[PDB]
Ligand binder design. Structure first.
Ligand SMILES: O=C(O)CCC(=O)N[C@H](C(=O)O)c1ccccc1
Ligand SMILES: O=C(O)CCC(=O)N[C@H](C(=O)O)c1ccccc1
Ligand SMILES: O=C(O)CCC(=O)N[C@H](C(=O)O)c1ccccc1
Ligand SMILES: O=C(O)CCC(=O)N[C@H](C(=O)O)c1ccccc1
Ligand SMILES: [Mg+2]
Ligand SMILES: [Mg+2]
Ligand SMILES: [Mg+2]
Ligand SMILES: [Mg+2]
Lengths: 367, 367, 368, 367
């Protein structure tokens, strides 16, 4: 396979409801989409960067620049290209895992469509549907949270994940546990908002039987997470820190993590994502799939990934209408708390051209 | 697809020269071959068991029985099969990794042929050819050994591996180093033939700068290998002990292994073999591909596997003519110390019926 | 003080000689300069990013973008500004340590000039001049390397650092040792080019008595460096991995490093650089100052930093004419293998406008 | 800058009420004050030594002697001095951290005023006010204590700290918890009064939700503190043991401490105090600022220091009217907080009428 070129497309899609996290409230999602063109056909990738560098150092403009001037040219200059060979060819470029992963996603989509093989087949799926949780952001009031959580439970989601913050942590959890019982799968995500010194306060969440606390401390404080694991009873889940299979290996060796959140864009592609799943499986560490408010493209790839054997916890693979009234692909519709693994070649979904054009704010061809 | 059936075939192929290890001399390789047939097409698998349970608990007759009465029936009874689902379907059957791996190899060959995809593509190859070492057995004299080793170096092999045993260790290595110099990649394999108490004698191998010592102690004495690593300087390579990705993870955690020999049949298939490669890579542990005097079928899958990124030491992926004057497939011919990674769909090679029938001693159809 | 604005100036400076490292041969150094303007006066900062993201994830264009659209706007919106408050104000922007460090450098220059205090005073200098080593890149032949090393020793540099790479390691070190003796302070830098599996080959460096092997493995493989340290004899020095005081603390706790290279831009500024120095001092770990082929501006701040008490090994603070025939500032001239710590307010140095304009390829004003 | 001289002053100041700790009952605080004179201006330093060697080996008379005959001469003999060079210049004198820290304090005030820069600026303050706790000494009865702490809570203090001793520990804590509730920030300090053999009693303090136990065992028993920390559940805080940044580093490496009390005079000055803050911060260890019943001079420097980012627990930086009247502008509590001074240097200076009023001795060491 020789890479003919890549179309970078900048897309803006409005959310049905604002989503508030430890670093801001967002009403519209700005995305970066890649259409890789090979003699065999087209392939699509999605970048999980956002407008600004508030979640990680990568953001849309920087991803677009590094892709346009380094990564895509490097692949275009290669004598032969395959999805597996993408990593060695872009290795001399330090960092930029989300851009690399988006590019690899597009390459792998094209490659697999050429072989009439799905992402689920290539990654090694063993399930035909995946159980799906939902991630509920920070709310302004407690009743407002209880209402949103009850609505999502009525829709059939099998797990609730609450974004927590200093000043908004023990109370919601208590409110949700009191109104909805102890049998609901409940977990929290802190987005690096705490410090090892906040260990007593986080221990106040022990009686509520959460499945996990996701990334309480800073991205690079792996040892601090191992220390925190000794002081609380809720299992520690790492997200922002898990950027590679080697990173998961090291965090496990150090006792810093008991459950791993695999974000394919964050680890540099779905291939590395499978590798993270595999090392965690070898060490007895459960994994689940993380979300980034993706379109149907990334959502489809994520459902494929989430059907692998060591995904023993429901992922952040919600339905399309949880974020978008109109997805740019075939919509993902919740059925009994589950999503069906796509079966078509490649991603099993593709942009609907009229819908994609209505949300396209920019496009450029690199060739 | 749905598995339509499996042709189980017993093959007897004579070796160019006897091959002697700490547990016996092999002169005729008795093998078990599998032909899986689906509506999509054919696939070939090879079992690496031997006639008797001298290397492991698995042997040809026992493999045939467990395949015929448990594994193949279980796969035939599934509504849908994929190479990835072979492991969950055969999970209720404890053990029998080599038979399972052969069955998976045949299913995967058929699956990949249906998609016109090579083993190298599915496993994640990054090289078009692999560098090849050779494994030299125990000899009667030192001059014999020196002549055989020089003959293999003149053929262009890039690494020499010496089978060692009590009474045949320090002297052959000294002889090889004195006759051929310090630049030859040299390593030894003992096949569990030593004991922790023999640690001083193995330390007598320190001055010669071997790459590794392969399986000094027994299959289950992993802790003993960690102790041996504290007592000797030559890096320790585990073979018979590496039966799964979890086994490798555990041995790495215990400081029992610094280089891993991946034998796909021994770990239960090529998919598990890739998982072992990935687990080792996350821990900084180099891997290389192991041999079992396979035919061109297993040899082709081995070359594919050995082209993955963390196979950073030359494997036991020798040419066909080091073992067989003919071989049942298109031969693997050494060119500049390298073997070319097959590019055809599936294994990229298939049996030549004329030759295969000449060496078949039994065949049965299970469907 | 409120920041009135920042001038971003892009500069292109030709090198006296090519400089080759594990990721390329460089003939011209492309730089970012920041001119912070406050009611009290001016301050200068320098970014240590390079043209492309070959050394780290940050590169010139990306640094300029994040500065222009996030960091400088964030500071302009601050009611009160001090160099110390730069870190909390930019905390919500993850990463971009080199851009942040350049901005903090400019703010700190302005603040210290407003208070008539030098960088050396603010950082805690204890000596008036610093000893200087030199970093020599990969060469084409061994004789070329021997000639360059002898020439640099004749200039009076007190330490030699050789860029090493797979295939160009044991031989250059053996050659330098044989010709120039056992008393030359010698050390090597690999720029992440090796792997734990390459441990035997790096052990072949054990007899030549190097001070350190700098960053043999990847940035994020800290455990791998501790394990290499168990298998070899030369002390392990971390460079690319030391991005913060917390990073240094963790590497020391894990046994991954015995000597730390402090690159102020790499850790996000000179205040964090001091913090790294203090952490390493508290654990008995020597530090030395790292270079990024900076102008006289970054060089002045670097010698100031390198005059702190725990910088007990010569840093990559070479003289100006080692890289540039004409520095944009007053030059730094080697005197007996030392450079003098500036004494003026702030950096103790400022760009000479005729010289700076000759090498300026772009400039933009971001302001209120 | 060339030190012109230092005026040594003995100050005797009445406390609002006696203050009792496990090492004695206090009725008047005798202190030692320093007036450094440089050509650029004046600076004031305070020594935290007390009348006798009851808290540490340093006491007022001995501090004055080592200053008058060794430390001040050494600084006077120097061509150029800066606050930073004070430590290297007095380094050949083993020990005497409190005297050196006071001398450094005065030199730094003079230096900072000469550059019209505050202490908070040099140290790197990021907050304009700091939250203040109060330290309550041993009382004669349980109700007597409750009146004192309730009065301190009515004044607006945000944390209550109780001095403990053999015979005064579980009971005062139970009383405060039941009378004043579970939301009061409460901690205890033993001043080395217990042993590892007393570990059982200190385990009885676990149910009441204290923030920490300050210095249970002797200053030099760091290992015993790590042994204790395994055995009890309330966090361990070290005070007397933290005498340098290297000492905090060593205690953290040994697991002997999770919260550090930074006493600038005890660690040898405010510069070292900042270094201790930075070391703990790099290790994820919260710090808080400690008091030594200082005047407004030490109180101003302590408030500045306590406004650095890792002071995440309210320090012993109580209001001036908790002990005194003060020889500077009093520090008046506002909503449980004190304001960080903004003037040059300390931002405060003695009011001559009040300073002379309490001065018992004066001597000039100079040129
Ligand atoms: O369902 C979805 O798509 C979202 C789930 C989600 O919260 N993703 C991550 C996280 O776990 O931090 C995230 C990342 C950035 C902002 C907000 C959230
Ligand atoms: O090139 C080849 O196929 C041979 C390499 C080799 O020695 N394989 C293994 C081993 O490591 O014990 C083996 C195991 C059992 C019998 C014979 C060999
Ligand atoms: O003398 C100087 O300024 C340079 C010294 C030096 O080598 N700096 C670093 C390094 O350590 O790799 C570096 C980083 C990137 C390119 C080239 C060098
Ligand atoms: O509020 C204040 O200034 C005092 C707080 C305090 O108790 N300081 C220390 C200590 O922690 O042991 C101390 C030292 C000497 C005597 C009495 C107390
Ligand atoms: Mg998360
Ligand atoms: Mg073997
Ligand atoms: Mg370096
Ligand atoms: Mg105390």
């Amino acid at each position: 396979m020789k890479l003919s070129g890549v179309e970078l497309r900048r897309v803006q899609m409005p959310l049905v409801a604002p989503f508030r996290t430890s670093f801001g409230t967002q009403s519209v999602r700005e995305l970066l989409l890649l259409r890789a063109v090979t003699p065999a056909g087209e392939g699509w990738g999605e970048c999980v960067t956002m407008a600004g560098p508030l979640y990680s150092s990568e953001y849309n403009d920087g991803a677009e620049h590094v892709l346009r001037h380094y990564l895509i040219p490097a692949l275009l200059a290669a004598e032969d290209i395959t999805a597996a060979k993408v990593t060695p060819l872009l290795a001399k470029f330090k960092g930029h895992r989300m851009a690399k992963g988006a590019l690899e996603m597009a390459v792998l989509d094209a490659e697999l469509r050429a072989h009439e093989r799905s992402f689920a087949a290539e990654l090694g799926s063993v399930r035909d549907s995946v159980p799906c949780g939902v991630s509920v952001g920070i709310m302004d009031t407690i009743p407002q949270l209880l209402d949103v959580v009850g609505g999502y439970l009525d829709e059939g989601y099998v797990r609730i994940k609450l974004k927590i913050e200093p000043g908004w942590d023990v109370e919601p959890v208590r409110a949700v546990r009191e109104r909805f019982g102890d049998d609901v799968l409940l977990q929290v995500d802190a987005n690096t908002a705490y410090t090892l010194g906040d260990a007593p306060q986080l221990a106040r969440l022990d009686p509520f039987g959460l499945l996990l606390i996701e990334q309480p401390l800073e991205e690079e404080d792996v040892l601090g997470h191992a220390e925190l694991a000794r002081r609380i009873q809720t299992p520690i889940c790492l997200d922002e820190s898990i950027v590679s299979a080697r990173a998961a290996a090291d965090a496990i060796k150090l006792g810093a993590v008991q459950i791993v959140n695999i974000k394919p864009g964050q680890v540099g592609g779905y291939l590395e994502a499978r590798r993270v799943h595999d090392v965690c499986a070898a060490h007895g560490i459960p994994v689940w799939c993380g979300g980034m408010i993706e379109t149907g493209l990334g959502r489809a790839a994520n459902v494929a990934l989430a059907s692998l054997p060591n995904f023993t916890l429901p992922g952040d693979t919600s339905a399309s209408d949880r974020f978008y009234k109109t997805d740019i692909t075939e919509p993902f519709v919740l059925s009994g708390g589950h999503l069906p693994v796509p079966t078509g070649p490649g991603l099993g979904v593709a942009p609907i051209p009229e819908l994609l054009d209505e949300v396209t704010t920019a496009k450029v061809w690199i060739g």
